[PDB]
């Protein structure tokens, strides 16, 4: 019941099964490919406080994976390390053979705690988590992944941004952005990676960082330089 697309004359036509068309020419298995695409390319929100809302925990359902031959470069990908309030791990260790997604411009690494009620974190829309040439129905601990879908057809540096959170598994989730080990700012859905990096440079340059052993949290004024009219990654 899985559709298979066929590309001819730069046109994508889904091949029917009920209607047999002699025109499709499969000469070798090298013409068959599994390609992973990211959800960011459809315009979904990518910012951490807006995307963790799409993930959630459940029990009684086992994980499954499939492989890829090719895929899209990601602007954004994630890496989670979430613990229960008592110190127990929420996410499972990745099994042998799982490695992080090979090409990301930004990695949003989130360290935190919360009410991790289920056994595994599943995607609520049915989308897959993408690892190095493997799509998975669940999130594995500590391993970088992109968020996306897979189609079947017949034919470098990155920046790590660190975040912290509490109440990770519920609606009242609080998020902070790390500037330094003792310096944080509040995170809001209006702050893109470029904004946040400019904000980080501004703080180091101004010197308004903790100079003691305790932590400091800054709020960002609601008036920001809103120069971008909700532009897509690609404009």
């Amino acid at each position, epitope marked *: 019941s899985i559709p298979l697309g066929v590309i001819h004359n730069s046109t994508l036509q889904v091949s029917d099964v009920d209607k047999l068309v002699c025109r499709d020419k499969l000469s070798s298995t090298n013409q068959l490919r599994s390609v992973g695409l990211n959800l960011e390319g459809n315009g979904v929100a990518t910012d951490v406080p807006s995307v963790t809302k799409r993930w959630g925990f459940r029990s009684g359902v086992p994980p499954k994976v499939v492989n890829y031959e090719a895929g899209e470069w990601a602007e954004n990908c994630y890496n989670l390390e979430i613990k229960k309030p008592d110190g127990s791990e929420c996410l499972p260790a990745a099994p042998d053979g799982i490695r992080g997604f090979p090409r990301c411009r930004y990695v949003h690494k989130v360290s935190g705690t919360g009410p991790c009620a289920g056994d595994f974190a599943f995607h609520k829309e049915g989308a897959f988590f993408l690892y190095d040439r493997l799509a998975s129905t669940v999130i594995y601990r500590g391993t970088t992944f992109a968020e996306g879908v897979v189609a079947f057809l017949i034919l470098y540096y990155s920046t790590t941004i660190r975040y912290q959170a*509490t109440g990770f598994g519920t609606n*009242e989730t*609080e998020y*902070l952005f790390e500037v330094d080990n003792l310096t*944080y*700012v*509040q995170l809001e859905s209006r702050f893109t990676p470029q904004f946040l990096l400019q*904000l980080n440079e*501004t*703080i180091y340059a*101004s010197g*308004k960082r*903790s*100079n*003691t052993t*305790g*932590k*400091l*949290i*800054w*709020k*960002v*004024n609601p*008036e*920001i*330089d809103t120069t971008i009219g909700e532009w897509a990654f690609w404009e």
Partner: antibody
Amino acid sequence: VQLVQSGAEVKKPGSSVKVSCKASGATFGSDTVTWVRQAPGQGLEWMGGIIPFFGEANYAQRFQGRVTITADKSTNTAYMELSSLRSEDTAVYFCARQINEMATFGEIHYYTYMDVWGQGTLVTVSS
Amino acid sequence: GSELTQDPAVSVALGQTVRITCQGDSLRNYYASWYQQKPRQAPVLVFYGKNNRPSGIPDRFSGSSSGNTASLTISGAQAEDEADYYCNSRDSSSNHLVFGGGTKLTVLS
């Protein structure tokens, strides 16, 4: 948003007092909960404060070793405990929500302010 | 933290403009917040940052700063503005909240 403090606490010297503060309309989130002291005829002294997000506390030097400040996020309340009360500690103790704010538009500016104040708790120490 | 300095008392004729000052190290690279305290009431935020105030504060209250000196301007001071006023900043070298001594503003009504 409101902060509700406990009523008057009157005790003899040598006793300890625990003054509560309850948030209403909001959780504490990542804001700072700070306590200050208003002695009769005086100005405002900083006593100390916490960040419930992390559970850390800081104190004004004159109260180090005398004051403990904690919080419970399941109730969105905070508590300040004073030990070894003396008559000079008679004062109204105030609970407030402190915001450390950075202005990122145009010129860069930094400032702090207390946005939400409780009504104050009178603590009287006398033999 | 280094303490802020304020003159203990200021008198203003009713209807006149009054300037309340604050000085110290915590004002050198920051802005002071100002509070109005009525008898038997919690301090009320009046003005903060470089240029704004919370709603509920009338357009009599505005202010500025330079160097290590900050001030609150009350234009057309009203009888209703009699209050203790306080400046507040943060001494980042100790991370202590610092209040000035305040001032008593007497409106000569």
